[PDB]
């Protein structure tokens, strides 16, 4: 079960600040070595808030820690983990370091609960961290180990390697990791595979060399001429060179034959001796040219060195990038090699690796930082890679799957690049532009608003009858719809041509409910599950059922039947919208106190009376003298009214045989603008709640005045979103739907209650994307150093 | 059927404002003649008469323009004869203790007589349907008025009548004119049957009395005066005595039945020794055992009031016949000598002296008036013929106005007017039924004599005193607000236990209370040694209720009848019967039995009262969302929440953090809370078969904040009553959209009086009984309501009473004069 890499990551002077940097900073570029403060720049620049470090506690902080810090939360954004998600994972961290002037708080800061080493470099070098990683990973000691190194003598301060003029080696800054895990856990988690980890070994002169390299190979079952490039130790020194060139010489150089000549390079010719770093970055080097089927090529120096026997068989320096030939068996492979002063010698064999979004057409690409300057930087990082190689759901899913959601967040909706460039332009400034959400994220549960009548159109939810979870539970109304009422709400929602019609109350009232319910369910699936429910006239009998009160079943028997009776009111009511509130509401109807109800108080600005129709004729007379903006409803039966103690006596007969149930979910009953158990929401209940009227601002005060502060609306149009802003005014609503948008509306609407802190399962919005290429956090750095 | 007198009024000059005042003036002997006056804008200077006397009327000129809805433009058109004669109409009613108001709309004629110096006005102003008729020209008198009012009332053409005449000599052309005529005494002085008659002066004056018959004074318990027992007119002596044999004609009597005649007496040489002969003739014959007939003429006092002197005369014989005492005559010098006195029977009224009565029993009596048209008049004057408020210990004396100044002075004139004589019942029952209410208004109440002075004097200056309400009227209906738990106290009610309409209501309730529960109302509030406990929650509320349903048919019987009703909690089980929607059979089935049911949540909650709006109330508990329930809303500062006691005190502690006055109440069950659900399936068991049925008042419900039908207040209702939230001022700020202003509280303890006034600032709220003052606080109270503008059926309220000089209106004067 071979070890995979799966992310790199890695810092080294010059301005080297990623794997991609750092081959284009190779071929062709790169010798990184001056004069004193080959050193990092910044390399005491940190970003103490970012991990939840005090400055007292940074600069107390050796830089080699900080460093490391960073470029570990880099590794984890280029292999596509939340590192969130790690913490208190069995998750290894092998490092090594050497004072001047480690593990154990990287895994802690981290949160992560598998091995942590420092493995000390002044003996060892970073391929026995490697080495020690990969061990753990096979045994079962974990399961995902970080390794790597980082550092915080030749006169001219270079490492002229297997180079006549090598007399001595020049010392770098750097912290090269990558990221370690079993292959099958790899792929079974989707990830990209970089590489293996064929074969590793380490001991304790040029026989020593040739042991171990022979040891290696005898690991990775392979043979020398099954590797076409070494990444060499080649520190540049008088006789190190000589040593393990001597020594590839004896080993690499010879069986061969119909394979050609080994390819030998020491990246510290270019960035210099990474002292802990070195290794992993030799690594580093080497995976990049396996992907890319290209031989890393070496910064050569005047001649070869003489001291060396190249007759010897075939291992000559590269110089320039060349074809990465495949061994016999058709894959490319390479050797890394590491000596520590100590003694210790180590070689690694790197072998090249063997919802429904559907119904919108934008798609949510998100951003989050721990501050907006870094938020309004990441903005600007991502012009960057848009556009050809990269669609938008495979961009997107990257950055909604792949990156811990931090505090201020922002949600760009596209359907096109272009656009997409813009609206990152206008967060860049802090600046609005269509599609374009910004937010700061807020914890806590989420409520569930069902509105009534007012919210339908023809074609409600027919984009979603596609999608698997949405369907399903409208086959289950289905079921039941047809059996009180001799007909499925599909019809009327596919709107087959001899469906009924939605003119009709008592078919809109449960179609309006299975769309309503199913919504539920599908929000569900995306991963958002509610904490308390808030029904409106019929919609209680949505809520209801979400909360557990009422069975499916149960619950269609009820706004059936109930707007089924209902039939009985048409054409003898009305209803009337008013912007005023409640008490200005009453003294305005009292003129016709009889004939007119007060329906419900939606907020303080928005009333809805109930009644006779020419009563609330000489009503809105009233109100346009008295200039109060009313608004006559499309109805013709006044519900929430004297009207509807005619259907009492049936309602009470035809839900009798109802269950109610104690709610599994706080239901706050809109009857009582008070929450109410459950049990008792039976057949007078729905007597009760359709004569009486809606307390929805009053429910909605109650919740709010529990701490509720986010509230996603179960509408095929958004009805109520005004109104609970307007009770709370630091509350926020999302609706789904919506008459014009119709899916565009929801998918824009989920991104928005992401933005807002509520918790969105994008793992299951998003299908199954490949690999992008996203940049990394902006750190705001403040310096540190004593 | 007899016509009676039943009420005088008059005005005349020397200050004399009543009847009762003239009867001082003249038995004192005063002569009302001065000098003539100025301020009229008078060339007295080049007047021409020759007496530069007269009896005017002490500011004819003034005018209380406002007091009659007349404007300050139209009263200087208007002539001050219409004026006087208005608001002395007014004094007449009041004299008679008829509310002017209760006249409207009423066929009451007006017979009135006066000439230039308006029956049809006055009936307008007073809104009278009856006949008018201006007696044209006073040239024959104020007497063929009467003649005519009488004769109405016999033709069934009307069923009060008012009569008389009015005099005010705007100007001085009738001096002038019997100036030259040579008939005018030169000062002024009307020296009737003297020796130094020499003429008439001319005098002002208004003199009005209200008739009925007497069968209709009667069933109005009226105070009969006196009666006219026959009148008659005709067109000399020989005339004089044909008048004055056909009067006694239709009388039915002889001139002996008659012991006091009132004479026309002008003083003039010719006029008495006419009349005086005349009477010789006819009262001075065939007496015998009757001694001699009595003259005078009130002339000899006051001048010869016109238009006016021909009701002042009867007015003079009604005062002496109830006195029982002739009146007396003013007389100077010796009789006149041009007089056959040697001829029989008739000497002159002197000075008082007993008035004999006829063989049959009735004194009585005659008054004469001729006038220059020649058109004359005899008429005969007969004498006449022949709970609550218990409970409490004061009576609640009424003053009404239609300005704060006019009753400043009400308060004046009543504080001397009426005290230690005469009881404060026979007083407060002639001002409460007697009188007109006005819009500003003021009830005193009072025990004692002293007390009622010193409150008088006390809004005499508009300053304060304990049982002193004033206010200011507000028409419209009345809402009865039922509350519940809080208010009973031990002994409750004791005192209307024994007044019959309470005592019934208590014994129906008692009933069917008996045969559903095992005990009486009555029991628990006689407080009896055997009576169940009013610490048991299965007991108060039966029996609160029962206090309930009486407290508002007490109510009913004085008058008040609720417009509509709001109960509390259980306070709906009483609003329930009060408004139609449960029999009271019912309605005590749901209040005995829900109460039973509601013991086994004794001893396992609690409620607490937070001095806070609702929306604050609901964060407060918010850390306690269960275990407490906000049960109450009473007001935009006072909430009740009841649950858990732990979570309660947990809760008082943290108001008392915040500096939220808070307090636990007296309670052990936590009602209208999650507690309740206990109990529903065995509520809605017990309650099962009771019968709602269309409220026949409005009823606002408190579970819904609103009016509701009532038919569908049947078991479940009483559950999701007591279980859900009292939305009361809900239910108030609802009646009060629909204009109500005025709740009162069918309580035995003023508890939600306050919130309804939070509710509406500007409403009214009264209560009925009150801990402390028991039955007292009520009459306090319903004067309280009254002062306000509720009506109150005060005639059932007091007892029937004997009559009572009360103070006439303090008129505010404007004076008008071109």
């Known amino acids: 079960d071979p070890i995979a890499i799966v992310g790199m990551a890695c810092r080294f002077p010059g301005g080297v600040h990623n794997p991609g940097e750092l081959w284009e900073f190779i071929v062709g570029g790169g010798d990184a070595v001056t004069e004193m403060p080959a050193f990092l720049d910044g390399a005491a620049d940190f970003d103490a808030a970012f991990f939840g470090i005090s400055p007292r506690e940074a600069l107390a902080m050796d830089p080699q820690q900080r460093q490391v810090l960073e470029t570990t939360w880099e590794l984890f954004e280029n292999a596509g983990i939340d590192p969130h998600s790690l913490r208190g994972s069995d998750t290894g961290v092998f490092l090594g370091a050497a004072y001047q002037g480690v593990s154990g708080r990287v895994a802690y800061v981290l949160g992560l609960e598998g091995p942590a080493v420092t493995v000390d470099t002044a003996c060892s070098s970073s391929l026995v961290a490697l080495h020690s990683a990969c061990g753990s990973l096979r045994d079962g000691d974990c399961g995902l180990a970080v390794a790597g190194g980082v550092s915080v003598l030749a006169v001219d301060g270079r490492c002229k390697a297997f180079s006549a003029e090598a007399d001595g080696f020049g010392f770098a800054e750097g912290v090269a990791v990558v990221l370690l895990q079993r292959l099958s856990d790899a792929r079974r988690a989707g990830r990209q595979v970089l590489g293996v980890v064929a074969g590793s070994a380490i001991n304790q002169s040029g026989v ?39 020594a590839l010489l004896a080993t690499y150089g010879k069986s061969r034959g119909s394979s050609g000549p080994v390819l030998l390079g020491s990246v510290k010719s270019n960035i210099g001796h990474a002292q802990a770093a070195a290794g992993v970055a030799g690594v580093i080097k080497v995976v990049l040219g396996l992907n890319r089927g290209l031989v890393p090529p070496m910064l050569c120096r005047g001649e070869r060195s003489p001291l060396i026997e190249w007759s010897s068989g075939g291992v000559e320096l590269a110089e320039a990038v060349s074809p990465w030939p495949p061994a016999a068996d058709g894959v490319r492979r390479a050797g890394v090699s590491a000596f520590g002063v100590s003694g210790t010698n180590a070689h690694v064999i790197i072998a090249e690796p063997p919802g429904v979004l559907a119904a919108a057409n934008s798609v949510p690409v998100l951003l989050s930082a721990r501050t907006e300057t870094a938020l309004a930087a990441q903005a600007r990082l991502l012009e960057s890679a848009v556009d050809d190689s990269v669609p938008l759901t495979a961009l997107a899913s990257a ?48 409520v569930f ?61 449960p179609v309006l409910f299975s769309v309503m319910v199913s919504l539920a369910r599908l929000w569900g699936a995306c991963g958002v599950s509610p904490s308390a429910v808030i029904g409106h006239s019929q919609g209680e009998i949505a809520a209801a059922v979400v909360a557990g009160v009422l069975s499916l079943e149960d ?126 929401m039976g057949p007078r209940y729905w007597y009760d709640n359709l004569r009486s009227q809606v307390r929805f601002d009053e429910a909605v005060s109650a ?24 009770i709370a005014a630091d509350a926020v609503a999302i609706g789904s739907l919506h008459r014009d948008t119709a899916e565009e509306h929801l998918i824009a609407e989920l991104a928005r209650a992401h933005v807002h802190g509520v918790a969105v399962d994008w793992r299951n919005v998003f299908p199954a994307a490949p690999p992008v290429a996203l940049p990394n956090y902006p750190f705001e750095p403040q310096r540190y150093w004593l």
């Open 399 to 446: 950055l909604a799957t792949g990156r811990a959601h931090l505090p201020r967040r922002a949600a760009l909706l596209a359907g096109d690049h272009e656009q997409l460039r813009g609206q990152l332009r206008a967060v860049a400034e802090g600046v609005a532009a269509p599609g374009a959400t910004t937010g700061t994220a807020s914890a806590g549960g989420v």
């Open 449 to 509: 608003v069902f509105p009534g009548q007012g919210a339908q159109w023809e074609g409600m939810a027919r984009g979603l009858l596609s999608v698997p979870v949405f369907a399903e539970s409208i086959a289950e109304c289905d079921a039941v719809l047809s059996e009180v009422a001799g007909f499925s709400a599909s019809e009327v929602l596919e709107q087959r041509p001899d469906a009924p019609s939605l003119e009709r109350v008592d078919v809109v009232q």
């Open 555 to 680: 619950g269609v028997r009820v706004v059936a039947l109930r707007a089924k009776a209902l039939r009985a009111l048409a054409g003898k009511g009305g209803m009337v919208s008013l912007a005023a509130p409640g008490e200005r509401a009453r003294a305005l109807i009292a003129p016709w106190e009889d004939r007119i109800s007060v329906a419900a108080v939606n907020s303080p600005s928005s009333v809805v009376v109930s009644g006779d129709p020419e009563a609330l004729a000489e009503l809105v007379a009233r109100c346009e003298d008295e200039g109060v903006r009313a608004k006559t409803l499309p109805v013709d039966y006044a519900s929430h009214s004297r009207h509807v103690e005619e259907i009492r006596e049936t309602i009470l007969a035809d839900l009798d045989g109802i269950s109610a149930r104690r709610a599994a979910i706080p239901l706050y009953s809109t009857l009582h603008g008070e929450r109410r158990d459950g049990a008792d």
């Open 703 to 726: 919740a709010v005045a529990d701490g509720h502060a986010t509230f996603v609306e179960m509408s095929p149009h958004p009805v109520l979103t005004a109104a609970v802003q307007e």
């Open 208 to 246: 020593a060399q040739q042991r171990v390299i022979r040891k290696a190979w005898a690991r990775a079952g392979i043979t020398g001429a099954d590797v076409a490039v070494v990444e060499a130790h080649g520190t540049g020194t008088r006789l190190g060179d000589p040593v393990e060139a001597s």
